[PDB]
Structure 1
Amino acid sequence: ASHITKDMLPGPYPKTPEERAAAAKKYNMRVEDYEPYPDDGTGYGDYPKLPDRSQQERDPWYDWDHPDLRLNWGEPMHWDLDMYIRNRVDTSPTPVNWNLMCKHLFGFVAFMLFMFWVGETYPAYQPVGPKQYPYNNLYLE
C-alpha cells in the first residue's frame, strides 16, 4: 500500500535531481551517472524516468564480495536496475575476440577436397594417366 508516486513518471527529465533521490535512490547526488537519465532513444515508452538504466553489465559476479551479500543471494536492500538475464551470464575471459574456431571449423574444410578423391589402398598412386581402370577397360575374355 505504497501511496503516492510508486514508479517512474513521464521522463526522461522534469528535474533529473528531483527523482534520484527523492525516493528510489539510483544515484546519490543526482549525478552518479545513475541519475534517472538513461532514456536513450525515447519516444519508445520503454524505460521512462526510471531510477534505473544503463548501469553496466555482464553479471552480478557471485563471489566473496561480502559486505553482507552483494550479488545474487542475500538481496541487498535496493539497487535493482535490470535483471533476469543475470543467472546465465559472467565476465572477462583470458583471450579476446579470436575466432580461431571458424578457422578450425573450416580447418577441415580444407579437406573437403580430400573428399572428392578416394582412399583406395591397392595399388599405390604410381603416376599414371590412362592406367586407372576401376573395373575393366579392354576386352572381357
Structure 2
Amino acid sequence: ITKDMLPGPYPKTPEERAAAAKKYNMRVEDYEPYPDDGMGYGDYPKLPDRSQQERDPWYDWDHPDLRLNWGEPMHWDLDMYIRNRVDTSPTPVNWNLMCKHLFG
C-alpha cells in the first residue's frame, strides 16, 4: 500500500475528480462525491444507498456472504447495510400505506 491510495480532500477541479475516480476504480461520470459541507466525508463516493439484499443472489461474488467483489468501492454504511441488518428491499405495498394501516 502506498500513500497515494488513501482517500484525500474534497475534489473541486475536474482533473482531481478524474484522478479520484481512477483511484476508486469507477468511471469518471459515475463518481459523485459527498457534498462539501465539512462533515469529514472527503472524496469518498456517494453510492446509490441500497442494501446488500438488493444485489444479485446468483452471480458469483468474491465474498458470497457479503455479496461483494474484490476491489469494488464499498458503501460508507456497508457495516449498516449487511444482510444481518436493516434492509431496503422493495415491498409489495407502499410504505405510507403500511404506516397508515398499522397506525390506524
TM-score (normalised: structure 1): 0.27
CA distance in 2, matches of 1:40, 1:54: 25
Deviations 1:26-80 (A, max 9, x none): 6778742414453368899998999999999999999858899862889779999
What is the Cα-based RMSD across aligned positions, in Å? 7.3
1:74 counterpart = 2:53: no
Check conservation: 1:36, 1:49, Cα contact below 8 A.
yes
Specify whether residues 46 and 73 from structure 1 end up closer, same or farther in structure 2 by C-alpha distance, changes over 3 A only: closer
Q: Unaligned stretches of 5+ in structure 2?
A: none
The 10-residue stretch of structure 1 (19-28 or 66-75) with the greater mean CA deviation from structure 2: 66-75
Shift in Å, 1:103 = 6.2
User: Separation in 1 of the partners of 2:77 and 2:103?
Assistant: 44
Maintained 8 Å contact 2:51/2:86: no
Summarize the Cα distance change of 1:36–1:8 in structure 2 as closer, same or farther, 3 Å threshold: farther
Q: 2:103, 2:50 → 1: CA distance?
A: 41
* Structure label with greater radius of gyration: 1
What is the percentage of aligned positions where both structures have the same residue?
99
Question: Which structure has more RCO (C-alpha within 8 Å, separation ≥ 6)?
Answer: 2
Q: 1:80 to 1:96 in 2, by over 3 A?
A: closer
- Give the whole-Å Cα distance in 1 for the aligned partners of 2:26 and 2:49: 14
Distance 1:27-1:56 versus aligned 2 partners, 3 A rule: farther
Post-superposition offset of 1:95:
1.8
Work out whether residues 37 and 49 of structure 1, in 8 Å CA contact, stay in contact via their aligned partners in 2. Answer: yes
Q: 1:30 to 1:85 in 2, by over 3 A?
A: same
- 5 Å-filtered alignment, 1:38-49, equals 38-39=35-36
Contact 1:9 1:48 in 2 (8 A): no
Calculate the TM-score normalised by the size of structure 2: 0.31
| Aligned counterparts of 2:58 and 2:86: Cα–Cα separation in 1 | 9
Which structure 1 segments of 5+ residues have no match?
108-141
